[PDB]
Amino acid sequence: GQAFRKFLPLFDRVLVERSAAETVTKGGIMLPEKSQGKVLQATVVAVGSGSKGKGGEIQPVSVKVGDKVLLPEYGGTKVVLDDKDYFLFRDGDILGKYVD
Amino acid sequence: GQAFRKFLPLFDRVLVERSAAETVTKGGIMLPEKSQGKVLQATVVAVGSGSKGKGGEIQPVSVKVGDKVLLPEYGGTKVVLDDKDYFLFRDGDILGKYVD
Amino acid sequence: GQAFRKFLPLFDRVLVERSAAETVTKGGIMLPEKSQGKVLQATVVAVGSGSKGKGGEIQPVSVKVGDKVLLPEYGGTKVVLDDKDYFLFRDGDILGKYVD
Amino acid sequence: GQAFRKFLPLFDRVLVERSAAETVTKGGIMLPEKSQGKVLQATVVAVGSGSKGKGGEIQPVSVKVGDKVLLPEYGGTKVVLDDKDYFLFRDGDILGKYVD
Amino acid sequence: GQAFRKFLPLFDRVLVERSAAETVTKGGIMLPEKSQGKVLQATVVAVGSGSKGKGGEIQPVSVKVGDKVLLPEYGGTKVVLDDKDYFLFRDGDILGKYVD
Amino acid sequence: GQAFRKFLPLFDRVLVERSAAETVTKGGIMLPEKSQGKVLQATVVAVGSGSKGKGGEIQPVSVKVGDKVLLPEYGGTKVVLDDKDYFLFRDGDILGKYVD
Amino acid sequence: GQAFRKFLPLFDRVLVERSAAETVTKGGIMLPEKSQGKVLQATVVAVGSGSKGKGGEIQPVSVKVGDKVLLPEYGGTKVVLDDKDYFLFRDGDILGKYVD
Numbered sequence: 001g002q003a004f005r006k007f008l009p010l011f012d013r014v015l016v017e018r019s020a021a022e023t024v025t026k027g028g029i030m031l032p033e034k035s036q037g038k039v040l041q042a043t044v045v046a047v048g049s050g051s052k053g054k055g056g057e058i059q060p061v062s063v064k065v066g067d068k069v070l071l072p073e074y075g076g077t078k079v080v081l082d083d084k085d086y087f088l089f090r091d092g093d094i095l096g097k098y099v100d
Numbered sequence: 101g102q103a104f105r106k107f108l109p110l111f112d113r114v115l116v117e118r119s120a121a122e123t124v125t126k127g128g129i130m131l132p133e134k135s136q137g138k139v140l141q142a143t144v145v146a147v148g149s150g151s152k153g154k155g156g157e158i159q160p161v162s163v164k165v166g167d168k169v170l171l172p173e174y175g176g177t178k179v180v181l182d183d184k185d186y187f188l189f190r191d192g193d194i195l196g197k198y199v200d
Numbered sequence: 201g202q203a204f205r206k207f208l209p210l211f212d213r214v215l216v217e218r219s220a221a222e223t224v225t226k227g228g229i230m231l232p233e234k235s236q237g238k239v240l241q242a243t244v245v246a247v248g249s250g251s252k253g254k255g256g257e258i259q260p261v262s263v264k265v266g267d268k269v270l271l272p273e274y275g276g277t278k279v280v281l282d283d284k285d286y287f288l289f290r291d292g293d294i295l296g297k298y299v300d
Numbered sequence: 301g302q303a304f305r306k307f308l309p310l311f312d313r314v315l316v317e318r319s320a321a322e323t324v325t326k327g328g329i330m331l332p333e334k335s336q337g338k339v340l341q342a343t344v345v346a347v348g349s350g351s352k353g354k355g356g357e358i359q360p361v362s363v364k365v366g367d368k369v370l371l372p373e374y375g376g377t378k379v380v381l382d383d384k385d386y387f388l389f390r391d392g393d394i395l396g397k398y399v400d
Numbered sequence: 401g402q403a404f405r406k407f408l409p410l411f412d413r414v415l416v417e418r419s420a421a422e423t424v425t426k427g428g429i430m431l432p433e434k435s436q437g438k439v440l441q442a443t444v445v446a447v448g449s450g451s452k453g454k455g456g457e458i459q460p461v462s463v464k465v466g467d468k469v470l471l472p473e474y475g476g477t478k479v480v481l482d483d484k485d486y487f488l489f490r491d492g493d494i495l496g497k498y499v500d
Numbered sequence: 501g502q503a504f505r506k507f508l509p510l511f512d513r514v515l516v517e518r519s520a521a522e523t524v525t526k527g528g529i530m531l532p533e534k535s536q537g538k539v540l541q542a543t544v545v546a547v548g549s550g551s552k553g554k555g556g557e558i559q560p561v562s563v564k565v566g567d568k569v570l571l572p573e574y575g576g577t578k579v580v581l582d583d584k585d586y587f588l589f590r591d592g593d594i595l596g597k598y599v600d
Numbered sequence: 601g602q603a604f605r606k607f608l609p610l611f612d613r614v615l616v617e618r619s620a621a622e623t624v625t626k627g628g629i630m631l632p633e634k635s636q637g638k639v640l641q642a643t644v645v646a647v648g649s650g651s652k653g654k655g656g657e658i659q660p661v662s663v664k665v666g667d668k669v670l671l672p673e674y675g676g677t678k679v680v681l682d683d684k685d686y687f688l689f690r691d692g693d694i695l696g697k698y699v700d
Contacts, residue, residue: 009696196209296309
């Protein structure tokens with residue numbers, strides 16, 4: 001399980017950081033902070049060792065550090081690292097990843 | 101798991117695009133946009149790698165990209181790709197496919 | 201899994217059509233349409249490939265196309281095929297079949 | 301699975317017919333129809349093939365046609381056969397049988 | 401499965417009879433019938449064949465006919481045999497037995 | 501399964517007796533009876549034979565008679581033995597034991 | 601399972617002690633006691649023997665005594681040891697550990 005800055009998620013949990021919100025539109029129209037909701041696009045920055053549901057060895061999570069993923073609407077857990085914001089999810093809560 | 105335009109669903113989720121709504125009736129009578137509800141007919145455009153419930157290898161989803169399927173009434177997840185609309189479902193949520 | 205007119209249910213779902221409602225009584229007394237509720241007698245016209253709960257091969261549904269079955273009170277899903285009405289159930293929701 | 305008059309329950313369901321209600325007492329005192337509730341004593345008249353929870357073959361129900369059983373208070377499903385009344389239960393819902 | 405007077409519980413159910421309520425106290429003070437609640441002490445008079453959760457043979461219930469057991473507060477089912485009163489429980493609902 | 505005075509818990513249930521409540525403080529200040537809530541410290545006095553979840557033999561409970569344990573806040577069952585008070589818990593409900 | 605001062609958790613529960621709350625800010629501004637909520641950072645001081653879900657031997661908890669862990673928002677159980685405060689959690693409730 002790849003770690004992060006003095007942190008390591010346990011079991012299948014994955015720690016991600018949300019992408020920056022869109023401040024302006026294509027033509028230059030700029031949006032208020034209270035709008036635009038929450039960003040569902042994130043980057044995987046830490047992965048846990050894996051689950052223990054299957055007997056024997058450990059099954060690693062499908063994602064890896066450095067992947068761009070689409071988060072679900074709800075289910076994240078707020079984590080504060082070096083005054084910055086990160087979100088801890090479960091492995092199965094991730095909707096999908098942007099292959100590129 | 102067949103991908104899509106810079107996207108790939110995780111586990112058994114399938115990404116589809118709903119068919120266009122019926123604007124006019126057979127005799128030419130046109131319908132207002134607020135009507136007709138939501139289209140339950142979709143086309144499978146992305147499939148995930150598969151579930152992990154069974155021990156060992158991966159069980160692929162029953163559908164494939166290019167299939168015309170009937171969606172359930174509720175259960176989809178809204179996804180935005182290149183400003184266009186797509187819906188992420190589970191593999192078992194699909195009611196059936198139009199064999200042709 | 202036996203199909204139907206450009207349709208095929210997925211997994212253990214079975215597509216049936218309900219029998220016609222009774223319009224008149226034995227002595228000729230005829231009933232209003234709003235009465236008689238919904239018909240619980242149906243004919244199996246489409247069967248899915250089967251469930252995947254058991255490891256290995258596929259376990260087919262117990263019913264076959266052409267069987268007269270008794271539907272449960274609730275649990276069906278409305279499907280429209282060639283402007284006609286059909287109902288999709290689960291394999292285990294069927295109460296029983298008329299052996300004849 | 302022993303059948304009935306043009307009927308056969310599916311899986312572990314058992315079709316029974318409730319015993320006739322007690323109209324009079326031992327000394328001749330007669331009871332109104334609206335009283336006496338519902339009879340919990342029934343006779344097994346149809347049994348299904350069996351469940352499929354255990355892998356491999358089919359496990360038949362513990363009861364057989366012709367057994368006098370004690371029904372639970374709630375859980376039955378009303379079935380109409382030749383204008384007569386029968387009740388479909390699950391195999392595990394039967395409280396016990398009168399051995400004689 | 402040891403039976404009772406023309407009765408036999410099915411699966412892990414156990415039929416017991418509650419002990420007689422305490423009418424008087426040690427010093428002779430008598431208690432009203434509406435008081436004293438319900439007796440949690442019973443005697444096992446019928447045991448079922450056993451459950452079927454484990455594959456293969458049948459696992460018999462831990463209790464036997466003639467055991468003095470402590471019933472749970474709620475969970476019993478009322479049964480009437482020869483105008484007398486008995487209670488049907490599950491095997492796991494019994495809190496314990498008085499070894500003597 | 502080590503028993504108690506004419507009693508034996510069934511399955512994984514464990515019978516304990518709560519410790520005496522604290523009547524006075526270190527400096528001599530005494531507390532009213534209605535206070536101090538309920539004592540979570542208990543002594544294991546009876547253990548059942550064990551659960552049957554695992555196939556084959558019986559796996560005994562982790563505690564033994566004579567162990568000082570910390571009870572959970574809620575989940576106990578009141579038992580009266582020789583006019584004295586005991587509490588029946590499940591094996592997994594015990595929070596921990598005081599090793600000494 | 602490593603113990604603590606006359607205490608040992610049973611099964612997969614882990615006993616931890618929360619870190620001291622932040623009284624002052626970096627620049628010297630002090631915070632009231634009623635503020636600052638509850639500390640989610642703790643140190644593992646006791647670990648149980650392990651779970652019994654897997655057949656055979658015992659699977660030990662992933663954490664060890666002396667680890668700095670991040671607690672979940674809710675789910676702990678208050679324990680009093682030598683007049684000091686500790687919290688009992690489950691093994692899977694721990695969000696992650698600070699690797700260092």
